[PDB]
Amino acid sequence: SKTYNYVYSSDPSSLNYLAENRAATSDIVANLVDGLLENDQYGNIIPSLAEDWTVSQDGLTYTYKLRKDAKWFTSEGEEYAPVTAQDFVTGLQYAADKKSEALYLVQDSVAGLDDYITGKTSDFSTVGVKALDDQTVQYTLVKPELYWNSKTLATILFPVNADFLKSKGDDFGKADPSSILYNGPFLMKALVSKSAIEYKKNPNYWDAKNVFVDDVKLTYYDGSDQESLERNFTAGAYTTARLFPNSSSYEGIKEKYKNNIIYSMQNSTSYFFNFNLDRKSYNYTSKTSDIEKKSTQEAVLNKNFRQAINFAFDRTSYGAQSEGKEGATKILRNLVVPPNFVSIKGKDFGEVVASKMVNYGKEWQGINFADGQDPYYNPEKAKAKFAEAKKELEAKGVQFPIHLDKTVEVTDKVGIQGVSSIKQSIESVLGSDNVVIDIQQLTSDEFDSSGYFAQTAAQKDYDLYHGGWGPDYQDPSTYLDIFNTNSGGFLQNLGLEPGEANDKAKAVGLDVYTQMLEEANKEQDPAKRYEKYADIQAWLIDSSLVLPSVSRGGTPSLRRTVPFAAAYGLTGTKGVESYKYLKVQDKIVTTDEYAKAREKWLKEKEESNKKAQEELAKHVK
Protein backbone atom coordinates (compact mmCIF):
# COMPACT_ATOMS: atom_id res chain seq x y z
CA SER A 1 0.00 0.00 0.00
CA LYS A 2 1.09 3.65 -0.32
CA THR A 3 0.88 6.36 2.31
CA TYR A 4 0.85 10.16 2.52
CA ASN A 5 2.29 11.50 5.79
CA TYR A 6 2.42 15.15 6.81
CA VAL A 7 1.02 17.54 9.45
CA TYR A 8 -2.01 19.60 10.36
CA SER A 9 -2.48 22.58 12.67
CA SER A 10 -6.23 23.21 13.03
CA ASP A 11 -8.43 20.86 15.02
CA PRO A 12 -12.06 21.11 13.88
CA SER A 13 -14.70 22.42 16.24
CA SER A 14 -17.07 19.85 14.69
CA LEU A 15 -17.60 17.74 11.59
CA ASN A 16 -20.90 19.46 10.84
CA TYR A 17 -20.40 20.22 7.17
CA LEU A 18 -23.98 21.55 6.90
CA ALA A 19 -23.64 24.10 9.72
CA GLU A 20 -20.00 25.29 9.71
CA ASN A 21 -18.31 27.85 7.48
CA ARG A 22 -14.80 27.30 8.95
CA ALA A 23 -12.21 25.57 6.77
CA ALA A 24 -11.16 23.66 9.89
CA THR A 25 -14.25 21.55 9.20
CA SER A 26 -14.50 21.50 5.40
CA ASP A 27 -10.78 20.71 4.93
CA ILE A 28 -11.55 17.41 6.66
CA VAL A 29 -15.00 16.63 5.29
CA ALA A 30 -13.76 17.23 1.72
CA ASN A 31 -12.16 13.76 2.07
CA LEU A 32 -15.20 12.09 3.63
CA VAL A 33 -18.35 13.38 1.90
CA ASP A 34 -18.96 14.06 -1.80
CA GLY A 35 -21.51 16.43 -3.31
CA LEU A 36 -23.02 16.66 -6.78
CA LEU A 37 -19.90 17.80 -8.67
CA GLU A 38 -16.13 17.93 -8.07
CA ASN A 39 -12.88 19.06 -9.74
CA ASP A 40 -10.41 17.42 -12.07
CA GLN A 41 -6.69 18.30 -12.10
CA TYR A 42 -7.40 21.39 -14.23
CA GLY A 43 -10.13 23.16 -12.28
CA ASN A 44 -12.97 21.96 -14.47
CA ILE A 45 -16.22 21.10 -12.70
CA ILE A 46 -16.84 17.40 -13.34
CA PRO A 47 -19.30 14.67 -12.24
CA SER A 48 -19.19 13.53 -8.64
CA LEU A 49 -22.32 11.95 -7.14
CA ALA A 50 -24.16 13.44 -10.13
CA GLU A 51 -23.27 11.58 -13.32
CA ASP A 52 -25.10 14.14 -15.48
CA TRP A 53 -27.02 17.39 -15.09
CA THR A 54 -29.05 19.91 -17.07
CA VAL A 55 -30.13 23.54 -16.74
CA SER A 56 -33.33 25.04 -18.12
CA GLN A 57 -33.19 27.60 -20.92
CA ASP A 58 -34.23 30.34 -18.49
CA GLY A 59 -31.39 29.32 -16.14
CA LEU A 60 -33.62 28.85 -13.10
CA THR A 61 -33.89 25.04 -12.89
CA TYR A 62 -30.93 22.68 -12.37
CA THR A 63 -31.56 18.94 -12.51
CA TYR A 64 -28.98 16.33 -11.43
CA LYS A 65 -28.91 12.58 -12.11
CA LEU A 66 -27.25 10.64 -9.28
CA ARG A 67 -25.17 7.56 -10.07
CA LYS A 68 -26.82 4.37 -8.88
CA ASP A 69 -23.72 2.84 -7.26
CA ALA A 70 -22.98 5.61 -4.73
CA LYS A 71 -23.52 4.57 -1.12
CA TRP A 72 -23.26 5.89 2.40
CA PHE A 73 -20.99 4.00 4.82
CA THR A 74 -20.39 4.18 8.56
CA SER A 75 -17.03 5.36 9.91
CA GLU A 76 -16.12 1.68 10.35
CA GLY A 77 -16.74 1.08 6.64
CA GLU A 78 -20.04 -0.80 6.80
CA GLU A 79 -22.70 -0.06 4.24
CA TYR A 80 -25.51 2.17 5.51
CA ALA A 81 -27.73 2.99 2.51
CA PRO A 82 -27.46 4.08 -1.12
CA VAL A 83 -27.26 7.82 -1.68
CA THR A 84 -30.62 9.16 -2.90
CA ALA A 85 -31.93 12.46 -4.18
CA GLN A 86 -33.88 12.91 -0.92
CA ASP A 87 -30.55 13.29 0.88
CA PHE A 88 -30.14 16.64 -0.86
CA VAL A 89 -33.57 17.83 0.21
CA THR A 90 -32.64 16.71 3.73
CA GLY A 91 -29.29 18.48 3.62
CA LEU A 92 -30.71 21.84 2.63
CA GLN A 93 -33.54 21.67 5.16
CA TYR A 94 -31.09 20.80 7.93
CA ALA A 95 -28.79 23.65 6.94
CA ALA A 96 -31.82 25.96 7.11
CA ASP A 97 -33.22 24.60 10.41
CA LYS A 98 -29.81 24.79 12.09
CA LYS A 99 -29.14 28.34 10.79
CA SER A 100 -25.94 27.20 9.12
CA GLU A 101 -23.13 29.72 9.19
CA ALA A 102 -22.77 29.30 5.40
CA LEU A 103 -26.44 30.00 4.58
CA TYR A 104 -25.46 33.08 2.52
CA LEU A 105 -24.48 30.58 -0.22
CA VAL A 106 -28.12 29.53 -0.72
CA GLN A 107 -30.58 31.66 1.29
CA ASP A 108 -30.95 34.30 -1.45
CA SER A 109 -30.48 31.88 -4.36
CA VAL A 110 -32.83 28.92 -3.83
CA ALA A 111 -36.51 29.83 -4.34
CA GLY A 112 -38.60 29.87 -1.16
CA LEU A 113 -35.57 29.28 1.07
CA ASP A 114 -35.34 32.75 2.60
CA ASP A 115 -39.06 32.58 3.49
CA TYR A 116 -38.49 29.23 5.18
CA ILE A 117 -35.35 30.23 7.11
CA THR A 118 -36.89 33.46 8.41
CA GLY A 119 -40.23 31.89 9.38
CA LYS A 120 -42.41 33.47 6.70
CA THR A 121 -43.39 29.92 5.76
CA SER A 122 -43.19 26.67 7.70
CA ASP A 123 -43.51 24.18 4.82
CA PHE A 124 -40.25 22.97 3.27
CA SER A 125 -42.22 21.69 0.31
CA THR A 126 -42.31 25.36 -0.78
CA VAL A 127 -38.48 25.44 -1.03
CA GLY A 128 -36.79 24.91 -4.39
CA VAL A 129 -35.11 21.56 -3.84
CA LYS A 130 -37.02 18.42 -4.80
CA ALA A 131 -36.30 14.71 -5.20
CA LEU A 132 -38.15 14.01 -8.43
CA ASP A 133 -37.30 10.34 -7.92
CA ASP A 134 -34.60 8.44 -6.06
CA GLN A 135 -31.88 9.35 -8.60
CA THR A 136 -32.97 12.88 -9.55
CA VAL A 137 -32.54 16.17 -7.60
CA GLN A 138 -33.95 19.41 -8.95
CA TYR A 139 -33.10 22.87 -7.65
CA THR A 140 -35.14 25.97 -8.50
CA LEU A 141 -33.46 29.38 -8.23
CA VAL A 142 -34.74 32.92 -7.76
CA LYS A 143 -32.57 34.24 -10.60
CA PRO A 144 -29.94 32.74 -12.92
CA GLU A 145 -26.48 32.10 -11.46
CA LEU A 146 -23.80 31.05 -13.95
CA TYR A 147 -21.76 30.19 -10.84
CA TRP A 148 -24.49 27.95 -9.36
CA ASN A 149 -22.76 24.69 -10.29
CA SER A 150 -19.56 25.89 -8.65
CA LYS A 151 -21.55 26.31 -5.40
CA THR A 152 -22.24 22.54 -5.33
CA LEU A 153 -18.54 22.13 -4.41
CA ALA A 154 -19.26 23.85 -1.07
CA THR A 155 -20.32 21.63 1.81
CA ILE A 156 -23.65 23.32 2.58
CA LEU A 157 -24.90 21.70 -0.67
CA PHE A 158 -23.66 18.22 0.31
CA PRO A 159 -26.21 15.49 1.09
CA VAL A 160 -27.13 13.85 4.39
CA ASN A 161 -29.26 10.80 5.12
CA ALA A 162 -32.46 11.76 6.95
CA ASP A 163 -32.73 8.52 8.93
CA PHE A 164 -29.15 8.91 10.19
CA LEU A 165 -29.78 12.58 10.98
CA LYS A 166 -32.90 11.74 12.99
CA SER A 167 -31.19 8.79 14.68
CA LYS A 168 -28.26 10.94 15.81
CA GLY A 169 -30.15 14.02 16.99
CA ASP A 170 -27.80 16.56 18.51
CA ASP A 171 -24.92 14.06 18.32
CA PHE A 172 -24.80 14.56 14.54
CA GLY A 173 -21.60 16.20 13.31
CA LYS A 174 -19.67 16.34 16.57
CA ALA A 175 -15.85 15.98 16.51
CA ASP A 176 -15.98 12.17 16.52
CA PRO A 177 -15.76 10.05 13.32
CA SER A 178 -18.99 8.19 14.15
CA SER A 179 -21.02 11.47 14.06
CA ILE A 180 -21.47 11.54 10.25
CA LEU A 181 -21.80 9.06 7.40
CA TYR A 182 -19.26 8.69 4.62
CA ASN A 183 -19.76 8.65 0.87
CA GLY A 184 -16.39 10.12 -0.20
CA PRO A 185 -12.93 8.77 -0.96
CA PHE A 186 -11.83 8.14 2.65
CA LEU A 187 -13.09 6.97 6.00
CA MET A 188 -11.84 8.78 9.07
CA LYS A 189 -9.93 6.30 11.22
CA ALA A 190 -8.50 8.71 13.79
CA LEU A 191 -9.44 12.19 14.95
CA VAL A 192 -7.46 12.99 18.10
CA SER A 193 -7.26 16.59 19.33
CA LYS A 194 -3.75 18.13 19.30
CA SER A 195 -2.43 14.82 17.99
CA ALA A 196 -3.59 13.24 14.75
CA ILE A 197 -5.97 13.15 11.81
CA GLU A 198 -5.89 9.83 9.96
CA TYR A 199 -7.76 8.72 6.83
CA LYS A 200 -8.05 5.27 5.27
CA LYS A 201 -9.06 4.74 1.66
CA ASN A 202 -12.66 3.49 1.40
CA PRO A 203 -12.31 0.51 -0.97
CA ASN A 204 -16.06 0.57 -1.67
CA TYR A 205 -16.23 4.26 -2.65
CA TRP A 206 -17.85 4.75 -6.09
CA ASP A 207 -14.58 6.24 -7.46
CA ALA A 208 -12.03 4.14 -5.53
CA LYS A 209 -10.08 3.73 -8.78
CA ASN A 210 -9.02 7.39 -8.45
CA VAL A 211 -7.73 7.05 -4.87
CA PHE A 212 -4.01 6.23 -5.04
CA VAL A 213 -3.04 6.42 -1.37
CA ASP A 214 -4.38 3.85 1.07
CA ASP A 215 -3.55 5.85 4.20
CA VAL A 216 -3.21 9.54 5.04
CA LYS A 217 -1.63 10.41 8.40
CA LEU A 218 -1.45 14.03 9.62
CA THR A 219 0.55 14.78 12.79
CA TYR A 220 -0.39 17.81 14.89
CA TYR A 221 2.00 20.74 14.36
CA ASP A 222 1.85 23.64 16.83
CA GLY A 223 4.59 25.74 15.23
CA SER A 224 7.19 25.28 17.96
CA ASP A 225 9.39 22.92 15.88
CA GLN A 226 9.50 24.27 12.33
CA GLU A 227 12.68 22.26 11.64
CA SER A 228 10.75 19.01 12.28
CA LEU A 229 9.12 19.22 8.84
CA GLU A 230 12.40 18.85 6.95
CA ARG A 231 13.81 16.55 9.66
CA ASN A 232 10.96 14.07 9.26
CA PHE A 233 10.95 14.38 5.46
CA THR A 234 14.65 13.56 5.28
CA ALA A 235 14.15 10.58 7.63
CA GLY A 236 11.51 9.22 5.25
CA ALA A 237 8.67 9.89 7.72
CA TYR A 238 6.95 12.74 5.85
CA THR A 239 5.92 12.86 2.19
CA THR A 240 6.54 16.60 1.98
CA ALA A 241 8.05 19.46 3.95
CA ARG A 242 7.68 23.23 3.94
CA LEU A 243 11.09 24.95 4.17
CA PHE A 244 11.87 27.98 6.35
CA PRO A 245 14.80 29.94 4.88
CA ASN A 246 15.19 32.11 8.01
CA SER A 247 16.24 29.11 10.08
CA SER A 248 19.82 28.40 11.08
CA SER A 249 19.08 24.98 9.57
CA TYR A 250 18.53 26.40 6.08
CA GLU A 251 22.22 26.73 5.17
CA GLY A 252 22.83 22.99 5.19
CA ILE A 253 19.39 22.12 3.85
CA LYS A 254 19.84 24.16 0.70
CA GLU A 255 23.22 22.48 0.30
CA LYS A 256 21.67 19.04 0.70
CA TYR A 257 18.67 19.93 -1.52
CA LYS A 258 20.24 22.38 -4.02
CA ASN A 259 18.27 20.81 -6.88
CA ASN A 260 15.04 19.91 -5.00
CA ILE A 261 13.57 23.18 -3.69
CA ILE A 262 10.13 23.71 -5.26
CA TYR A 263 8.07 26.91 -5.08
CA SER A 264 4.30 26.69 -5.33
CA MET A 265 2.05 29.11 -7.18
CA GLN A 266 0.05 31.64 -5.21
CA ASN A 267 -3.55 30.50 -4.98
CA SER A 268 -7.02 32.01 -4.54
CA THR A 269 -7.03 32.05 -0.73
CA SER A 270 -6.51 35.66 0.38
CA TYR A 271 -5.42 36.92 3.78
CA PHE A 272 -5.79 40.46 5.14
CA PHE A 273 -5.62 42.33 8.43
CA ASN A 274 -8.75 43.93 9.80
CA PHE A 275 -9.71 45.99 12.82
CA ASN A 276 -12.10 45.14 15.62
CA LEU A 277 -14.67 47.91 15.11
CA ASP A 278 -16.69 47.22 18.28
CA ARG A 279 -14.47 45.52 20.85
CA LYS A 280 -16.17 44.12 23.95
CA SER A 281 -13.61 41.68 25.46
CA TYR A 282 -10.34 42.86 27.08
CA ASN A 283 -8.92 39.69 28.63
CA TYR A 284 -5.80 40.05 26.41
CA THR A 285 -4.60 43.64 26.34
CA SER A 286 -1.70 45.82 27.35
CA LYS A 287 -3.96 48.83 27.84
CA THR A 288 -4.24 49.82 31.50
CA SER A 289 -7.11 52.31 31.52
CA ASP A 290 -10.52 52.90 30.06
CA ILE A 291 -9.33 56.06 28.33
CA GLU A 292 -6.80 54.02 26.33
CA LYS A 293 -9.54 51.53 25.39
CA LYS A 294 -11.96 54.26 24.30
CA SER A 295 -9.15 55.97 22.38
CA THR A 296 -8.48 52.82 20.36
CA GLN A 297 -12.23 52.30 19.84
CA GLU A 298 -12.41 55.76 18.25
CA ALA A 299 -9.19 55.39 16.23
CA VAL A 300 -10.22 52.23 14.38
CA LEU A 301 -13.39 54.01 13.21
CA ASN A 302 -11.30 56.83 11.67
CA LYS A 303 -10.56 56.36 7.96
CA ASN A 304 -7.34 58.41 7.97
CA PHE A 305 -6.06 56.30 10.87
CA ARG A 306 -6.72 52.99 9.11
CA GLN A 307 -5.09 54.35 5.95
CA ALA A 308 -2.06 55.44 7.96
CA ILE A 309 -1.70 51.89 9.31
CA ASN A 310 -2.11 50.53 5.77
CA PHE A 311 0.75 52.65 4.35
CA ALA A 312 2.97 51.99 7.36
CA PHE A 313 2.65 48.20 7.12
CA ASP A 314 5.75 46.86 5.35
CA ARG A 315 4.54 43.71 3.57
CA THR A 316 8.04 42.82 2.33
CA SER A 317 9.52 42.73 5.82
CA TYR A 318 6.50 40.71 7.03
CA GLY A 319 6.82 38.12 4.26
CA ALA A 320 10.56 37.88 4.88
CA GLN A 321 9.91 36.50 8.37
CA SER A 322 8.62 33.22 6.94
CA GLU A 323 10.10 33.24 3.40
CA GLY A 324 13.50 34.84 3.96
CA LYS A 325 14.92 37.94 2.31
CA GLU A 326 15.05 36.38 -1.14
CA GLY A 327 11.50 35.08 -1.23
CA ALA A 328 9.80 37.73 0.94
CA THR A 329 7.56 39.01 -1.84
CA LYS A 330 6.56 35.61 -3.29
CA ILE A 331 3.47 35.41 -1.03
CA LEU A 332 2.10 38.97 -1.27
CA ARG A 333 -1.56 39.50 -2.17
CA ASN A 334 -2.88 43.03 -2.58
CA LEU A 335 -6.62 42.55 -3.05
CA VAL A 336 -9.17 40.32 -1.42
CA VAL A 337 -10.33 39.11 -4.83
CA PRO A 338 -7.19 37.67 -6.54
CA PRO A 339 -6.11 40.00 -9.37
CA ASN A 340 -6.80 37.40 -12.09
CA PHE A 341 -9.84 35.77 -10.41
CA VAL A 342 -12.00 37.04 -13.29
CA SER A 343 -11.40 39.18 -16.32
CA ILE A 344 -13.38 42.01 -17.89
CA LYS A 345 -13.08 42.19 -21.69
CA GLY A 346 -9.65 40.58 -21.35
CA LYS A 347 -8.50 42.91 -18.57
CA ASP A 348 -7.68 41.32 -15.23
CA PHE A 349 -9.98 42.24 -12.34
CA GLY A 350 -7.03 43.71 -10.44
CA GLU A 351 -6.07 46.03 -13.27
CA VAL A 352 -9.67 47.28 -13.38
CA VAL A 353 -9.61 47.91 -9.62
CA ALA A 354 -6.28 49.70 -10.02
CA SER A 355 -7.75 51.90 -12.74
CA LYS A 356 -10.54 52.91 -10.31
CA MET A 357 -8.36 53.85 -7.30
CA VAL A 358 -7.15 57.39 -8.17
CA ASN A 359 -10.83 58.40 -8.22
CA TYR A 360 -10.88 57.65 -4.46
CA GLY A 361 -7.90 59.90 -3.74
CA LYS A 362 -4.55 60.99 -5.10
CA GLU A 363 -2.75 58.92 -2.45
CA TRP A 364 -3.55 55.90 -4.65
CA GLN A 365 -1.98 57.27 -7.84
CA GLY A 366 -0.08 54.55 -9.68
CA ILE A 367 -1.11 51.69 -7.38
CA ASN A 368 -0.45 48.24 -8.87
CA PHE A 369 -2.39 45.31 -7.43
CA ALA A 370 -0.36 42.47 -8.98
CA ASP A 371 0.54 39.55 -6.75
CA GLY A 372 4.11 39.33 -5.54
CA GLN A 373 5.05 42.95 -4.75
CA ASP A 374 4.18 45.55 -2.07
CA PRO A 375 2.32 48.59 -3.49
CA TYR A 376 1.09 49.82 -0.08
CA TYR A 377 4.19 50.54 2.02
CA ASN A 378 4.99 54.23 1.85
CA PRO A 379 6.22 56.01 4.99
CA GLU A 380 5.63 59.53 3.72
CA LYS A 381 2.00 58.79 2.79
CA ALA A 382 1.51 57.02 6.12
CA LYS A 383 2.83 59.95 8.15
CA ALA A 384 0.63 62.40 6.23
CA LYS A 385 -2.51 60.31 6.77
CA PHE A 386 -1.66 59.93 10.44
CA ALA A 387 -1.26 63.68 10.96
CA GLU A 388 -4.79 64.17 9.63
CA ALA A 389 -6.13 61.32 11.79
CA LYS A 390 -4.50 62.74 14.91
CA LYS A 391 -6.09 66.17 14.47
CA GLU A 392 -9.53 64.62 13.90
CA LEU A 393 -9.18 62.21 16.84
CA GLU A 394 -7.60 64.62 19.35
CA ALA A 395 -10.67 66.86 18.98
CA LYS A 396 -12.80 63.91 20.21
CA GLY A 397 -10.64 63.50 23.32
CA VAL A 398 -8.62 60.62 21.91
CA GLN A 399 -5.30 60.04 23.65
CA PHE A 400 -2.11 58.90 21.95
CA PRO A 401 -0.34 56.57 21.34
CA ILE A 402 -3.11 54.37 20.03
CA HIS A 403 -2.48 50.87 21.41
CA LEU A 404 -3.53 48.01 19.10
CA ASP A 405 -3.60 44.45 20.43
CA LYS A 406 -2.60 41.64 18.07
CA THR A 407 -2.71 38.04 19.22
CA VAL A 408 -0.39 35.19 18.30
CA GLU A 409 0.01 31.65 19.57
CA VAL A 410 2.92 31.30 22.02
CA THR A 411 4.12 28.16 20.22
CA ASP A 412 3.94 29.76 16.75
CA LYS A 413 7.56 30.89 16.48
CA VAL A 414 7.33 31.96 12.82
CA GLY A 415 4.06 33.76 13.50
CA ILE A 416 5.70 35.60 16.38
CA GLN A 417 8.42 36.89 14.06
CA GLY A 418 5.72 37.99 11.61
CA VAL A 419 3.77 40.01 14.16
CA SER A 420 7.06 41.41 15.52
CA SER A 421 7.79 42.72 12.01
CA ILE A 422 4.40 44.45 11.80
CA LYS A 423 5.05 46.08 15.19
CA GLN A 424 8.48 47.22 14.07
CA SER A 425 7.38 48.67 10.72
CA ILE A 426 4.25 50.46 11.94
CA GLU A 427 6.03 51.95 14.96
CA SER A 428 9.12 52.87 12.91
CA VAL A 429 7.06 54.81 10.36
CA LEU A 430 4.38 56.41 12.56
CA GLY A 431 6.35 56.71 15.79
CA SER A 432 5.79 54.79 18.98
CA ASP A 433 4.45 57.97 20.57
CA ASN A 434 1.61 57.70 18.04
CA VAL A 435 0.91 53.97 17.61
CA VAL A 436 1.97 50.95 19.66
CA ILE A 437 1.36 47.40 18.48
CA ASP A 438 0.95 45.26 21.61
CA ILE A 439 1.60 41.59 20.88
CA GLN A 440 -0.38 39.19 23.08
CA GLN A 441 1.13 35.69 23.16
CA LEU A 442 -1.64 33.26 24.01
CA THR A 443 -2.10 29.62 24.82
CA SER A 444 -3.93 27.50 22.28
CA ASP A 445 -7.19 27.67 24.23
CA GLU A 446 -6.76 31.44 24.67
CA PHE A 447 -5.91 32.00 21.00
CA ASP A 448 -8.78 29.84 19.72
CA SER A 449 -11.47 31.30 21.97
CA SER A 450 -10.56 34.95 21.30
CA GLY A 451 -10.33 34.63 17.53
CA TYR A 452 -11.02 31.92 14.98
CA PHE A 453 -13.29 29.82 17.22
CA ALA A 454 -14.98 32.69 19.05
CA GLN A 455 -18.72 32.23 18.61
CA THR A 456 -19.81 35.87 18.89
CA ALA A 457 -18.45 39.27 17.93
CA ALA A 458 -18.40 40.24 21.61
CA GLN A 459 -15.94 37.40 22.36
CA LYS A 460 -13.34 38.71 19.88
CA ASP A 461 -10.44 39.86 22.05
CA TYR A 462 -8.03 41.94 19.94
CA ASP A 463 -7.87 45.20 18.01
CA LEU A 464 -6.13 43.75 14.92
CA TYR A 465 -6.95 40.42 13.33
CA HIS A 466 -5.26 38.46 10.53
CA GLY A 467 -7.65 36.11 8.84
CA GLY A 468 -8.46 35.02 5.35
CA TRP A 469 -11.07 33.86 2.92
CA GLY A 470 -11.08 30.88 0.63
CA PRO A 471 -13.58 31.34 -2.21
CA ASP A 472 -16.75 29.23 -2.11
CA TYR A 473 -17.92 29.77 -5.73
CA GLN A 474 -16.77 31.38 -8.96
CA ASP A 475 -17.85 35.03 -8.65
CA PRO A 476 -16.24 38.11 -6.97
CA SER A 477 -19.14 38.20 -4.54
CA THR A 478 -17.82 35.16 -2.64
CA TYR A 479 -15.07 37.43 -1.32
CA LEU A 480 -16.68 40.79 -1.31
CA ASP A 481 -19.94 39.73 0.39
CA ILE A 482 -18.14 38.75 3.61
CA PHE A 483 -18.23 42.31 4.98
CA ASN A 484 -21.92 42.96 4.22
CA THR A 485 -23.93 44.03 7.26
CA ASN A 486 -26.93 41.73 6.61
CA SER A 487 -25.09 38.41 6.48
CA GLY A 488 -21.31 38.85 5.89
CA GLY A 489 -19.39 35.75 6.94
CA PHE A 490 -16.49 37.92 8.19
CA LEU A 491 -18.59 40.41 10.21
CA GLN A 492 -17.91 38.88 13.61
CA ASN A 493 -14.14 39.21 13.04
CA LEU A 494 -14.73 42.93 12.63
CA GLY A 495 -16.67 42.98 15.94
CA LEU A 496 -20.03 43.33 14.16
CA GLU A 497 -23.06 41.07 14.12
CA PRO A 498 -25.12 40.36 10.98
CA GLY A 499 -28.47 42.11 11.17
CA GLU A 500 -29.21 45.83 11.15
CA ALA A 501 -26.01 47.85 10.86
CA ASN A 502 -25.20 49.56 14.15
CA ASP A 503 -23.74 53.03 14.52
CA LYS A 504 -20.14 51.75 14.22
CA ALA A 505 -20.91 49.92 10.97
CA LYS A 506 -22.46 53.13 9.66
CA ALA A 507 -19.56 55.25 10.92
CA VAL A 508 -17.17 53.35 8.61
CA GLY A 509 -19.65 53.17 5.74
CA LEU A 510 -20.37 49.45 5.67
CA ASP A 511 -24.04 50.20 5.11
CA VAL A 512 -23.13 51.99 1.87
CA TYR A 513 -20.81 49.07 1.00
CA THR A 514 -23.71 46.67 1.55
CA GLN A 515 -26.05 48.70 -0.68
CA MET A 516 -23.35 48.63 -3.39
CA LEU A 517 -23.21 44.83 -3.11
CA GLU A 518 -26.97 44.54 -3.49
CA GLU A 519 -26.95 46.62 -6.67
CA ALA A 520 -23.99 44.83 -8.21
CA ASN A 521 -25.57 41.44 -7.51
CA LYS A 522 -28.50 42.37 -9.80
CA GLU A 523 -26.24 42.52 -12.87
CA GLN A 524 -26.25 39.32 -14.92
CA ASP A 525 -23.93 40.33 -17.78
CA PRO A 526 -20.50 39.14 -16.55
CA ALA A 527 -18.44 42.11 -17.83
CA LYS A 528 -20.79 44.72 -16.32
CA ARG A 529 -21.23 42.66 -13.15
CA TYR A 530 -17.52 42.29 -12.62
CA GLU A 531 -16.91 45.98 -13.22
CA LYS A 532 -19.44 46.81 -10.50
CA TYR A 533 -17.67 44.42 -8.12
CA ALA A 534 -14.38 46.07 -9.10
CA ASP A 535 -15.81 49.40 -7.89
CA ILE A 536 -16.75 47.67 -4.65
CA GLN A 537 -13.28 46.19 -4.18
CA ALA A 538 -11.77 49.64 -4.88
CA TRP A 539 -14.05 51.24 -2.27
CA LEU A 540 -12.95 48.59 0.20
CA ILE A 541 -9.22 49.14 -0.41
CA ASP A 542 -9.67 52.90 0.00
CA SER A 543 -11.65 52.38 3.24
CA SER A 544 -8.69 50.41 4.64
CA LEU A 545 -11.17 48.27 6.58
CA VAL A 546 -8.97 45.44 5.25
CA LEU A 547 -5.19 45.59 4.78
CA PRO A 548 -4.41 42.90 2.20
CA SER A 549 -1.39 40.80 3.14
CA VAL A 550 -0.61 37.37 1.72
CA SER A 551 -1.97 34.36 -0.14
CA ARG A 552 -1.49 30.68 0.29
CA GLY A 553 1.21 29.27 -1.95
CA GLY A 554 4.40 30.91 -3.17
CA THR A 555 6.39 28.92 -0.61
CA PRO A 556 9.34 26.48 -0.85
CA SER A 557 8.94 22.77 -0.24
CA LEU A 558 10.57 19.39 -0.67
CA ARG A 559 8.26 16.82 -2.21
CA ARG A 560 7.71 13.14 -2.87
CA THR A 561 4.18 13.80 -4.15
CA VAL A 562 3.69 13.44 -7.90
CA PRO A 563 3.48 16.93 -9.49
CA PHE A 564 -0.03 18.03 -10.56
CA ALA A 565 -1.65 14.68 -9.84
CA ALA A 566 -4.21 16.08 -7.38
CA ALA A 567 -7.44 17.87 -8.19
CA TYR A 568 -7.31 21.66 -8.49
CA GLY A 569 -10.17 24.10 -8.04
CA LEU A 570 -10.25 27.87 -8.24
CA THR A 571 -13.12 27.75 -5.72
CA GLY A 572 -14.83 25.26 -3.43
CA THR A 573 -13.46 22.40 -1.38
CA LYS A 574 -12.79 19.57 -3.89
CA GLY A 575 -9.29 20.52 -5.11
CA VAL A 576 -6.14 20.62 -2.99
CA GLU A 577 -8.25 19.92 0.12
CA SER A 578 -8.97 16.42 -1.15
CA TYR A 579 -6.47 13.54 -1.07
CA LYS A 580 -8.34 11.90 -3.94
CA TYR A 581 -6.20 11.76 -7.15
CA LEU A 582 -3.01 12.62 -5.21
CA LYS A 583 -0.11 10.22 -5.87
CA VAL A 584 3.14 9.54 -4.01
CA GLN A 585 6.44 8.38 -5.49
CA ASP A 586 9.83 7.14 -4.24
CA LYS A 587 11.95 9.89 -5.82
CA ILE A 588 12.38 13.34 -4.30
CA VAL A 589 11.14 15.61 -7.09
CA THR A 590 13.71 17.97 -8.59
CA THR A 591 13.24 21.64 -9.36
CA ASP A 592 13.74 20.96 -13.08
CA GLU A 593 11.28 18.04 -13.06
CA TYR A 594 8.71 20.16 -11.28
CA ALA A 595 9.11 23.01 -13.74
CA LYS A 596 8.69 20.66 -16.69
CA ALA A 597 5.56 19.20 -15.09
CA ARG A 598 4.26 22.71 -14.30
CA GLU A 599 4.66 24.00 -17.88
CA LYS A 600 2.93 20.86 -19.10
CA TRP A 601 0.03 21.34 -16.63
CA LEU A 602 -0.31 25.07 -17.40
CA LYS A 603 -0.60 24.41 -21.13
CA GLU A 604 -2.93 21.44 -20.73
CA LYS A 605 -5.12 23.43 -18.36
CA GLU A 606 -5.93 26.18 -20.86
CA GLU A 607 -6.77 23.60 -23.50
CA SER A 608 -8.84 21.56 -20.99
CA ASN A 609 -10.77 24.62 -19.70
CA LYS A 610 -11.66 25.64 -23.27
CA LYS A 611 -13.08 22.21 -24.03
CA ALA A 612 -15.02 22.22 -20.76
CA GLN A 613 -16.60 25.56 -21.65
CA GLU A 614 -17.69 24.15 -25.00
CA GLU A 615 -19.24 21.13 -23.25
CA LEU A 616 -21.45 23.47 -21.17
CA ALA A 617 -23.94 24.15 -23.97
CA LYS A 618 -24.86 20.46 -24.26
CA HIS A 619 -26.39 20.69 -20.76
CA VAL A 620 -28.97 23.37 -21.61
CA LYS A 621 -32.46 21.82 -21.63
Partner: peptide, 11 residues
Protein backbone atom coordinates in the same frame (compact mmCIF):
# COMPACT_ATOMS: atom_id res chain seq x y z
CA UNK B 1 -14.92 29.53 4.00
CA UNK B 2 -13.09 31.22 6.83
CA UNK B 3 -9.44 30.21 6.88
CA UNK B 4 -7.34 30.44 10.02
CA UNK B 5 -4.55 28.28 11.40
CA UNK B 6 -1.31 29.87 12.55
CA UNK B 7 -0.23 33.41 11.65
CA UNK B 8 -0.83 34.44 8.04
CA UNK B 9 -0.76 31.53 5.60
CA UNK B 10 1.12 29.41 8.10
CA UNK B 11 1.34 25.63 8.13
Amino acid sequence: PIVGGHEGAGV
